[PDB]
Amino acid sequence: GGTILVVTGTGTGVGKTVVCAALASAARQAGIDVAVCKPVQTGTARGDDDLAEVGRLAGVTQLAGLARYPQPMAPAAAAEHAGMALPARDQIVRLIADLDRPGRLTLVEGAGGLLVELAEPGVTLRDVAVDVAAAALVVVTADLGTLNHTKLTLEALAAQQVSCAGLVIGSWPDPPGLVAASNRSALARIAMVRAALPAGAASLDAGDFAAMSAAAFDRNWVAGLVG
Amino acid sequence: GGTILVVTGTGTGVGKTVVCAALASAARQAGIDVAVCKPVQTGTARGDDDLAEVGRLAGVTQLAGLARYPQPMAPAAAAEHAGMALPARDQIVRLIADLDRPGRLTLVEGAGGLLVELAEPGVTLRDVAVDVAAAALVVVTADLGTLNHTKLTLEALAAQQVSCAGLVIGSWPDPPGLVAASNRSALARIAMVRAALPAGAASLDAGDFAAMSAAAFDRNWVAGLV
Ligand SMILES: Nc1ccn([C@@H]2O[C@H](CO)[C@@H](O)[C@H]2O)c(=O)n1
Ligand SMILES: Nc1ccn([C@@H]2O[C@H](CO)[C@@H](O)[C@H]2O)c(=O)n1
């Protein structure tokens, strides 16, 4: 196989989807074949489609979905509101292992945070990480409360021996406020900050995003994810 | 001695102080002696003092604290920006133990969420709850994301064998709304929801607040605390 990464966040609305796109765009630019997998998508009735947005920002075509639910809610609630069932654990692992292949970076974007339920009963992105043996890239904010949320997410990763690939501040303000600046420093003492994506990165066009992505991440880290 | 309950939140700005006040009010109105200890406070530049807020809302007089930083940041960063260290783990645990006496519900209010640095060296509210054999009451929101944050926090509690005294929804919105209605049922499926506090209860005078507080909590669970 290749390298599988679950992209998770300390919370909802932290920029996971554009981090996903950024690392995909940066990894394409290092000659790495990228597949992006969103096994559970909610809010489709409101237009939400994270796989689609990764294609528009990162130019990725190897996009893999599975479950889509209309209501913008936690997957368990969005499914029930629509009379549909959650997928099974093995249906999600199968979707991932099928995309996997050597020399490929496969990105698995979660639904909201790490312990959100994606399959019955209480199956989470973290259990999926264990099954496909993936490390976890954690997307964070620079805002107040980030440290507690980051530390909680990291502790939950370690408790199942899932590897932390590092953090990404999903939306970085220019100029940084005082709060944002201390949080960025405090976050680096917690773990490695692989990138800090500029706010508004999702309104960039194809070339601007690709440029942004190549500068956001350390080339050597990106290249070292696939061997 | 008595009962020591730590009150923590899944995050900042979730109504943790109001919940502290409301539980203190409800407990007093069952004839329980209540103290509230908030070791570290921040944000006292932009007009704060959560202990004063508890005193005004709940009428508690045993209000104990050790440190206050003006910056609206987590302790460690407010302390760092201040040029002045956080209290020692010793100071906090000894103060909580000094407060704790028979018949008394001593509430311990954290600074932010469960796992931020509270004392030296790198001690958290979780370490404090362990040292004083305190259960933890977790304040949660009803908004999208609460279920993740609440599992994360309950997992962090169980990991160190800190008992969980239940959850409290800090701000119940009016009208509820689609996700909040769902989360309430979902939250009730992870842990006992001791109360959901109406939004805006901070602006209430003392008589209204105490009436809201008596209504909010199950009178028999409040009394069984002590
Ligand atoms: N670096 C970032 C991060 C996020 N966003 C936008 O903000 C929302 C998620 O944070 C989403 O609406 C996303 O498009 C952005 O534009 N740039
Ligand atoms: N049930 C609640 C909970 C919170 N609040 C107010 O909202 C602010 C943010 O937590 C709090 O500081 C407090 O002013 C409220 O009014 N009623």
Residue pairs spanning A and B at CB distance below 8 A = 103
Q: Which residue has the tokens 């005193």?
A: B55
Query: Rounded to the nearest whole angstrom, what is the distance from the C-alpha of residue B25 to the centroid of ligand 2?
Result: 16
| 3-state DSSP of B26-77 | HHHHCCCEEEEECCEECCCCCCCCHHHHHHHHHCCCEEECCEECCCCCCHHH
Q: Do A74 and B147 make contact, defined as CB atoms within 8 angstroms?
A: yes
Structure tokens at B222: 């409040």
User: Is-catalytic flag, B151?
Assistant: no
Class for the domain spanning B1-226: alpha beta
Kindly list the residues from chain A whose CB atom is less than 8 angstroms away from the CB atom of residue B16: none
Residues B173, B148 contacting (CB under 8 angstroms)? no
> Looking at residue A88, what DSSP letter applies?
P
Method used to determine the 3D structure: X-ray
Structure tokens at B98: 């000094």
Q: Do A145 and B113 make contact, defined as CB atoms within 8 angstroms?
A: yes
Name the resolution in angstroms: 2.4
Return d(Cα B169, Cα A165) in angstroms, integer: 34
Distance from chain centroid for Cα B92: 16
Residues A182, B80 contacting (CB under 8 angstroms)? yes
Query: β-strands B117-119, B123-124: how paired?
Result: antiparallel
Which residue among B152, B156, B182 places its CB closest to the CB of A77?
Answer: B182
CB within 8 A of B145, min separation 6: which ones? A11, A12, A13, A112, A113
Domain boundaries, chain A: 1-227
Q: Which residue has the tokens 């994506």?
A: A197
CB within 8 A of B46, min separation 6: which ones? B72
| Dihedral sign, Cα of residue A114, residue A118, residue A124, residue A130 | negative
In CATH terms, the fold of domain A1-227 is Rossmann fold (3.40.50)
Return d(Cα A16, Cα B136) in angstroms, integer: 31
Return d(Cα B137, Cα B21) in angstroms, integer: 13
CB within 8 A of A137, min separation 6: which ones? A5, A6, A7, A8, A19, A23, A165, A166, A167, A168, A194
User: How many other C-beta atoms are found inside a 10 Å radius of the C-beta of residue A69?
Assistant: 25
Beta strands in chain B, from DSSP E residues, in sequence order: 3-9, 33-37, 40-41, 62-64, 67-68, 104-113, 117-119, 123-124, 135-140, 164-172, 193-198
**Residue in B closest to A184 by C-alpha:** B77
Q: Which of A13, A58, A31 is nearest to A216 (CA)?
A: A58
B15 known member of a binding site: yes
Buried b (16+ CB within 10 A) or exposed e, A111-143: bbbbbbbbbeeebbbbbbbebbebbbbbbbbbb
Return d(Cα B169, Cα B188) in angstroms, integer: 10
Q: Which helix (H) or strand (E) holds B115?
A: none
CB within 8 A of A94, min separation 6: which ones? none
B110 known member of a binding site: yes
Q: Which residue has the tokens 């570290």?
A: B40
Q: Which residue has the tokens 């990138």?
A: A195
Does ligand 1 come within 6 angstroms of the Cβ of A141?
no
Residues B4, B134 contacting (CB under 8 angstroms)? yes
Kindly list the residues from chain A whose CB atom is less than 8 angstroms away from the CB atom of residue B189: none
Distance from chain centroid for Cα A171: 13
Q: Which of A224, A198, A155, A144 is nearest to A19 (CA)?
A: A198
Residues B86, B76 contacting (CB under 8 angstroms)? yes
Number of H helices, E strands in chain A: 9, 9
Residues B53, B72 contacting (CB under 8 angstroms)? no
Residues A108, A128 contacting (CB under 8 angstroms)? yes
